[PDB]
């Protein structure tokens, strides 16, 4: 069941992906609204896949190791230059996260693009599944592919102050490494901004 | 059924899978309008109390169901038993606006007065949690501010509410027993 993703000019093809899972929508809501009065200009040089490291899922991380990433995180390329030199923007974020498992070491990772991350008291982690999520388990699929649309109190919002989405990754079953399974499996999630717009050009120094 | 599962696809099986049948469901009670229509007591403040949600106690019904969704939209019906004329202001009014009293008010009428104060916040839909200051919610998510010389109680009922983006709900803690075992109401003897 090869899935051949694509965004802009970078591709990603995983022969083990189990399936894309749209969260909260299949498409983004209208873009030209009372805010900005129509000065928004879809930018399309930012729709790209960019890697980002995550915690090295180890044999010993017990249930409930929430490694969050807040989005958009510090991008240094085109998206970074863009969020630097533009006042307002919006995106959907078709995240993708991988765990290369040897298929002999059992474990069940749970990735979930939770919106408006607040802290978990470790009772909330039992039912954290409400948010869009995919299970990563070396058993069957080393790859999870989530896409969520931009949802915030506003149409646009400065990414420096209110970062809505935060990819969280809980560990439901400790990596059991058997005789032949990998000792230490790292998780690299590729996050791609989608349907990005901009507005409020800011005078750069 | 044995569905692939790992994709976290929404799978629901019925008792039909073993010579059962599924009876009809009437879920007119677990509805989110009919469950948000009821009053819920917000803590009262004697001077210039500000009326807004996320101040209710977390474990009450409306409070919890509210924290159950990130983005809530709703108009309020408020019930206050104040002791002097009670004045309200919209969402962006300077705190000194409360003494003008030409803005909406209500004079002492015997018991508690019941108002309807619509949803005025400029944000497209409010939030029960805000990641990043712009933990305290920003100053803009209040509905109004109601100021009486002394406020005794405030009840608040959200009309035509609609929620979004569900969140955890956190049922009561249990300790080394089979079930919670709370004394349910029983007839006399």
């Amino acid at each position, epitope marked *: 069941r090869i899935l051949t993703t694509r965004n802009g000019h970078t591709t990603s093809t995983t022969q083990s992906s189990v399936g894309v899972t749209y969260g909260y929508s299949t498409g983004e809501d209208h873009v030209s609204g009372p805010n900005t009065s129509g000065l928004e200009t879809r930018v399309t040089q930012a729709e790209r896949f960019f890697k980002k490291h995550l*915690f*090295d899922w*180890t*044999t*010993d*991380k*017990a*249930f*409930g*190791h929430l*490694e969050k990433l807040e989005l958009p995180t510090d991008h240094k390329g085109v998206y970074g230059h863009l969020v630097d030199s533009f006042a307002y923007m919006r995106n959907g974020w078709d995240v993708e996260v991988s765990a290369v498992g040897n298929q002999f070491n059992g474990g069940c990772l749970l990735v979930a693009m939770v919106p408006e991350y607040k802290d978990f*008291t*470790l*009772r909330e982690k039992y039912q954290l599944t409400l948010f869009p999520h995919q299970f990563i388990s070396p058993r069957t699929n080393m790859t999870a592919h989530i896409t969520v649309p931009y949802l915030g109190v506003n149409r646009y919002d400065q990414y420096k102050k209110h970062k809505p989405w935060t990819l969280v990754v809980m560990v439901l079953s*400790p990596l059991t*490494v058997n005789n032949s399974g990998a*000792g*230490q499996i790292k998780v690299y999630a590729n996050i791609a901004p989608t349907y990005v717009h901009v507005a409020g050009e800011l005078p750069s120094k | 059924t044995t569905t692939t599962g790992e994709s976290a696809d929404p799978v629901t099986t019925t008792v039909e899978n073993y010579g059962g049948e599924t009876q009809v469901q009437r879920r007119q009670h677990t509805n989110v309008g009919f469950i948000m229509d009821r009053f819920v007591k917000i803590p009262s403040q004697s001077p210039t109390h500000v009326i807004d949600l996320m101040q209710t106690h977390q474990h009450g019904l409306v409070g919890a169901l509210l924290r159950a969704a990130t983005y809530y939209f709703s108009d309020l019906e408020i019930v206050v038993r104040h002791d002097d004329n009670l004045t309200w202001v919209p969402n962006g009014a300077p705190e000194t606006a409360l003494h003008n009293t030409s803005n909406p008010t209500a004079y002492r009428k015997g018991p508690f007065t019941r108002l309807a104060l619509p949803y005025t916040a400029p944000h497209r839909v409010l939030a029960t949690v805000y990641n990043g200051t712009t933990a305290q919610l920003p100053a803009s998510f209040n509905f109004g501010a109601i100021r009486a010389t002394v406020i005794h109680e405030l009840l608040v009922r959200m009309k035509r509410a609609e929620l979004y983006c569900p969140r955890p709900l956190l049922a009561v*803690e249990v*300790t*080394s027993q089979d079930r919670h075992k709370q004394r349910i109401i029983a007839p006399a003897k």
Partner: antibody
Framework: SQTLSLTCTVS????????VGWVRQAPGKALEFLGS???????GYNPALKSRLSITKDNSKNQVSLSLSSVTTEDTATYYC????????????????? | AVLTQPSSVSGSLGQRVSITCSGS????????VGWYQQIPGSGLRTIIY???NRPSGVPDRFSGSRSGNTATLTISSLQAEDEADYFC???????????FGSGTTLTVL
């Protein structure tokens, strides 16, 4: 022959939510893991110092107890309590890290 | 004392000073380490648990990197007060008891 037992009243961080474990700083900068007890009650001891201690937790009193076998010239140390995340420890030596 | 870590390392205000932890595929190769800070007149404090995580209240300076067979505690810019003894916490499959680093005791110079 001076069997000792010491407890530290947990302030917040409920034992079911977070499991505690003792650890002692041996004379000098040396450190040594004394045991851990998972939130449910199951414990994991230091196999070296094993059979010499007992770690019993009570959910009501909101405290935890450690009953060591006896004291010697090496047993004297600055003792400390820990609040690990990951309330159940997958491995006994694994907790030392969190 | 299974983990050998620099017995001492010297620092100055302004620059980035890191501290390796000398481990092996037994304990640091497949298991995550911890970094504790101990002042002369104070006990322990946890700086980096789970190796790459930072607990509540620690300044953004401290960064924990486990890349490679030797964990490194990387400080952005050493400060005159962050001068303290750092310890290594990790789990080794070979011995039930965990291994603890002897220390690194910083200086300001």
């Amino acid at each position: 022959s001076q069997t000792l037992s010491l407890t530290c009243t947990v302030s917040g961080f409920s034992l079911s939510d977070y499991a505690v474990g003792w650890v002692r700083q041996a004379p000098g900068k040396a450190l040594e893991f004394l045991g851990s007890i998972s939130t449910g009650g199951n414990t994991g001891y230091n196999p070296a110092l094993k059979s010499r201690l007992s770690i019993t937790k009570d959910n009501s009193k909101n405290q935890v107890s450690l009953s060591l076998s006896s004291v010697t010239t090496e047993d004297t140390a600055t003792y400390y309590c820990t609040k690990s995340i990951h309330s159940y420890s997958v491995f006994e030596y694994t907790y030392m890290q969190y | 004392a299974v983990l050998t870590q620099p017995s001492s390392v010297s620092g100055s205000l302004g620059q980035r000073v890191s501290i390796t932890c000398s481990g092996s595929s037994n304990n640091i190769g497949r298991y995550d380490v911890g970094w504790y800070q101990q002042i002369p007149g104070s006990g322990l404090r946890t700086i980096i648990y789970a190796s790459k995580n930072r607990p509540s209240g620690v300044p953004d300076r401290f960064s924990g990197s486990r890349s490679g067979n030797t964990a490194t505690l990387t400080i952005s810019s050493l400060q005159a007060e962050d001068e303290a003894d750092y310890f290594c916490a990790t789990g080794d499959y070979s011995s039930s008891t965990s291994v603890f680093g002897s220390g690194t005791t910083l200086t300001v110079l």
